[PDB]
Amino acid sequence: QTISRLRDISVPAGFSNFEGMRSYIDNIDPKGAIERNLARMSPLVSATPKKLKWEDLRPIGPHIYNHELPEVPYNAFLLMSDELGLANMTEGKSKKPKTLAKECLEKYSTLRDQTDPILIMKSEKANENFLWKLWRDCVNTISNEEMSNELQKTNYAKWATGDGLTYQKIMKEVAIDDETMCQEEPKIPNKCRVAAWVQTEMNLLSTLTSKRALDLPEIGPDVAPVEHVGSERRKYFVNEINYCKASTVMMKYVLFHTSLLNESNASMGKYKVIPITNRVVNEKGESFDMLYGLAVKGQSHLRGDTDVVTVVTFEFSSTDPRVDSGKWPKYTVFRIGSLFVSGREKSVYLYCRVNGTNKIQMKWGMEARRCLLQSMQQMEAIVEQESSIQGYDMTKACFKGDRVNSPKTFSIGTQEGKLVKGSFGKALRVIFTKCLMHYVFGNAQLEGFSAESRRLLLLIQALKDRKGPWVFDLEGMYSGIEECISNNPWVIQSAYWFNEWLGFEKEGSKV
Amino acid sequence: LALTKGDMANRIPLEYKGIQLKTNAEDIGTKGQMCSIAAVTWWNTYGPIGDTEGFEKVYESFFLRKMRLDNATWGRITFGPVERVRKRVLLNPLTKEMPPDEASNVIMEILFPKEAGIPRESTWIHRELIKEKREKLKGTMITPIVLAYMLERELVARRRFLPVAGATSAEFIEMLHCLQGENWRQIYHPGGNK
Amino acid sequence: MNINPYFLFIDVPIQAAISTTTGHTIDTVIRTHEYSNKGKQYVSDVTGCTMVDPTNGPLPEDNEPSAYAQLDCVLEALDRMDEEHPGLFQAASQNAMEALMVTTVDKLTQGRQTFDWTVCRNQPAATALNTTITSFRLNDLNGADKGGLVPFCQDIIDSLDKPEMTFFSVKDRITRVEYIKRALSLNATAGIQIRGFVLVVENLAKNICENLEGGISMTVTGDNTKWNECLNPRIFLAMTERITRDSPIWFRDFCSIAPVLFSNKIARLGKGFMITSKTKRLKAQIPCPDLFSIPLERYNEETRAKLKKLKPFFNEEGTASLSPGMMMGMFNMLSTVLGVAALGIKNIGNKEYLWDGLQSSDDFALFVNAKDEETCMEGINDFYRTCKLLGINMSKKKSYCNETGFGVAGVNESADMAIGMTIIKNNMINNGMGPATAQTAIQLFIADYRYTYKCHRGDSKVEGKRMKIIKELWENTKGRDGLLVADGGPNIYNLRNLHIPEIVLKYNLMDPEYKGRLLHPQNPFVGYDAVSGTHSWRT
RNA sequence: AGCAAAAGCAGGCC
RNA sequence: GGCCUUGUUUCU
């Protein structure tokens, strides 16, 4: 009976009793209800759409062009354009990576005990006298057979990987009188300029090297024609990327994240040392055990899913730290040696970054061979568009040219304001490394920018097909775009590439 | 990864070429000692020999699917757009058709002949199906959960909605992905008995 | 050489690149209550808490989202809906009439996230009905003796009138009001005490909905903002009472309960936030119930700026009530019924326009048949106004009017193989994954598995404590292909050979004494589709 | 120190 | 200051 009382309590505005609401609800007139409200409504509550023109498509986020902003750094997790590890030769027996390190560094024992450091680009908080002693004790615990990956209890990693730098949780009734107990602020994203070197890394992780480090396990045979053309396109693609440099990058990253999570599970407190490994075969069949790097992992009791552990990543490098000094503001650069590798000079500087990861990034890094699939189905949609133009299996029109469709030139780059036409394999390498670099430095701002720019891409598509869309809020869309273009180096340079592409469609859309 | 007690823990070895295979303690949930995975390969290379009756007999429908694959013929790969109909069709070609509640009851009657119950009319029409497979299950000791799972797999239908075009028979519903996707179809003919 | 990855789009169309084209709680509460601040505000007495109500408020004067809606417009919209539905209210009422007689308490177990009434947190509906038995059957509630849902709902709608209560949590005795409100509160949870009731109204909406459906045509496409956060239960109750007005008296006694309990839904205030002593280096945690009990100046700008608007709807016992609201959707087909009713008006004022839009979920698409383009403009204007009349808001930010036109699973070996293959199988069949993508997905899955359990090929140059015995078997057997992948050997899959398990594809080429070593029925360690055997084992 | 825009982590227990 | 689940986590 209290339920009946509350049933009367949920009377809307206007009636008194729920019985009165019911006798109202079955004995009221239908007509004369809505159009009187239409005459009653405001003359301002409206939508009032608006036809879309070219001239409102302004440069997205022109605050990047102001020259009183700091340079876009390189704040990813490893090194991509400047990879260098040593030159090795083994049989093909997949050894333990301890022995891979104990082999490859012992081969180049010019850098065995180069105990003469020369500090180069030391940043605001990185200190010389914990990194150097840390790295020398670490590599003096690679070249001995006491055991496998560990370290010793020292203060050096206790500074550069961070014991004791969390607070002490204490009951809250004494957290009332102390006026210092204040809520934090959000992280202020420092706005940053356009990129002038990430263009070179899209110029350099798309070049045919002489290396290949990709294996794929075999499948069963085939007799079906769909399987014939499926494996046909698959082998053409995997032939056309296997000598890219990003394949080496990809397999470095995958082996790195795999070893990282597996040893973080298998070692929680013993500070491991992981060789950064990627075996790469040559053209003829000889293997290479390329070691470039050593890592350091601190104490790793990981309860939930946003626990983090400090991953210091040493990595031997070739090109000098003295060209774009803003690119490396978290790069401690010791100097250890130099190697006349084949011809002239290349130096040895190891770049002692400090860094950290959470388990979503590790598990999401173990998955990072997935980007092959996205690039593959992107290529699939491209060639199904092309065969929708012609009518049958027409990747044979792409690699050699069929009866009607020549291998078509694809616009990829632009020199002095004039376009260049790369080959098909060039563009497929490009699509692959785009979906990779979408992963490499990918955080939530990129998903935000992509999920909001997709509508503008659809809009400019419909503008290209003369459909003439109508948008209620251009300022809403643009505010949604440039709310988050702040400080992730793929995002800003994607916006610059957008502005140049928009300028090209503007100058080419005169008819 | 525990073990059943007794001589069962003596047909595997303890240590083989340095590798461990089992433990020597006792657990607390099922009160046993653990094993390896090198044990599960050691039994595949060097264990005692089994028998090969019933294992053929209780799984037959997927062998029928196997020979339907191996007797099939393909045709032409097509191109161009397609139009599909989101239709609920039977997915796999079922052996025999019966309601699932009385089906579970009559396979429970097959399992327990003394605890079968009363002879009903469905049991009276299905008694020849009872006997003609009760004569099949004699030569083995396959576990009743395995028997019941294969029987409920071989006797209950499967209806879900999906886009489809061309054919409607459940063999084609099983092979629709080799038939067609979204811009291509494949002429295909299944083989053997359907 | 300057290069630009967007330069694909000079040739390839962008419509083909589709694959690459506590704080939340309090902000949701503010976005609900902010939309009808100046509406009607009637204070309850069973709780006495502040409970604001957007029914029959004044009309807004802006473009922002709101919640204001009169009643009789909704009532006659559903009336005209019934005028296009001859006896479909009668049909749905009789359908629930035959459905409710067979209602048992069976439908509880499918509740992988489901709130309970004692533990104060989420359960997978496991001990839900058992807790109802051990906490109600000592209070002379008796429904499981018959097993039907109907005596259970009868004595549970009689249960809140009991002034005291006694149950084992230790034991516990409380009085009436907390016995009510502890069953009222939602942590986007639900209530198992009302889950059957909302299932009744949900299948009511199912029976309602499942049978349903020169002149320049502009068209639109868009969703609706604050869609959970702007509707209201009073409109729900008037809807279901309009439906039951030809039903017998017990149905109107019983169908008018679910919007009653959604007409007093309290809300739990999340986990909380935190503070910082940057020098003293000691912290604490202000939890869900005790937000305002603090120095209110000792927060940031943002929490203080939210609480300064929150506070006049705050229960003193730490869970603020939201008299409108829907909270991530649990009346989804019912709100869909409301939305398609909003679409079905099809004219106002009899101008030179007409609508033929189709139903959908919270998103939609219109088909406006009008005379000239300006008639389309005014018709879209009055469509937005009429949709505004029902407490609904159209998103003008995510729309475009236009001219017409996850790796390996890991429970065993064999069924792991089977489940991965059927995931890739159904993913191929549903959304049109291209065959090269799944063909490579087979390879990436085999590489995932052959890392996961170290079962590589014996003719490889991998090492390991596991792989040596596999190599030993390889140099032992004459069965040049008849192995399964957890014991070395190849993998023989492709696009076609998908719906078979392992052993019942590789039995024919298999070795006799090897398969006799495999299919031994005295296998001591053993305790989609599958096949029994040695590999079918568990922890 | 470093990571990351759900207020968190850079240990717990003893 | 000790314990946090004896290890080999060897991608053609």
Structure, described:
The complex is a heterotrimer of chains A (511), B (194) and C (539). Chain A is 39% helix and 11% strand. Chain A is of the alpha+beta class and 511 residues long. Chain A has a four-stranded antiparallel beta sheet. Chain B is of the alpha+beta class and 194 residues long. Helix content of chain B is 36%, strand content 13%. A two-stranded antiparallel sheet of chain B has the order 1-2. Chain B has a two-stranded antiparallel ribbon with strand order 3-6. In chain B, strands 4-5 form a two-stranded antiparallel ribbon. In chain B, helix 4 (100-111) packs across helix 5 and helix 4 (100-111) runs antiparallel to helix 6 (144-155). By secondary structure, chain C is of the alpha+beta class. Chain C is built from 18 helices and twelve strands. Chain C has helices at residues 23-33, 72-83, 88-101, 128-136, 149-157, 176-184, 192-209, 233-243, 249-255, 258-261, 301-310, 332-343, 373-388, 414-431, 435-452, 467-476, 503-506, 512-518; strands at 2-3, 40-41, 52-53, 114-115, 122-123, 164-168, 171-175, 216-219, 282-283, 353-355, 368-370, 402-403. In chain C, helix 14 (414-431) runs antiparallel to helix 15. Chain C is globular, with a radius of gyration of 31 Å. Chains in contact: A-B, A-C, B-C. At the A-C interface, helix 1, helix 2, helix 3, strand 1 and helix 7 of A face strand 1, helix 2, helix 8, strand 9 and helix 13 of C. Strand 1 of chain A pairs parallel with strand 9 of chain C, so a sheet runs across the interface. The structure holds two RNA strands.
Distance between the termini of chain C: 58 Å
Binned strand content of chain B? 5-15%
Largest sheet, spatial ordering of strands of chain B: 1-2
Helix content estimate of chain C: 25-40%
The span between the termini of chain B is: 42 Å
Number of strands of chain B: 6
Helix content of chain B: 25-40%
- Main sheet of chain C, how many strands, which sense, barrel? 4 strands, antiparallel
Most extensive chain interface and residues per partner? A-C, 129 and 132 residues
Strand order of the largest sheet of chain C: 10-11-8-12
Global geometry of chain C: globular
Determine the number of helices of chain B (DSSP H or I, runs of at least 4 residues): 8
Round the Cα radius of gyration of chain C to an integer and report it.
Answer: 31 Å
Subcellular location (chain A): Host cytoplasm; Host nucleus
Cofactor (chain A): Mn(2+)
Motif (Nuclear localization signal 2 (NLS2)) (chain A): 1-39
GO biological process, one term (chain A): viral RNA genome replication
